Amino acid sequence: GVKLLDISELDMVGAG
């Protein structure tokens, strides 16, 4: 099954 990630585990790689 698909796991859920919280917003704190989203690294700021989308900005780099």
Partner 1 sequence: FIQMSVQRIVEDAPPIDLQAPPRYLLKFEQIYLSKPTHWERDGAPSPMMPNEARLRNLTYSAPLYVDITKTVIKEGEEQLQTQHQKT
Q: Which residues bind partner 1 (CB under 8 A)?
A: 1-7, 9-10, 12, 14-16
- The size of the chain, in residues, is 16
CB of 16 to partner 1, least distance (A): 7
Structure tokens of 14?
A: 């989308």
CB of 9 to partner 1, least distance (A): 8
CA distances to 1, 2, 6, 11, 12 from 16, rounded to whole Å, are 30, 26, 20, 10, 7
CB of 12 to partner 1, least distance (A): 6
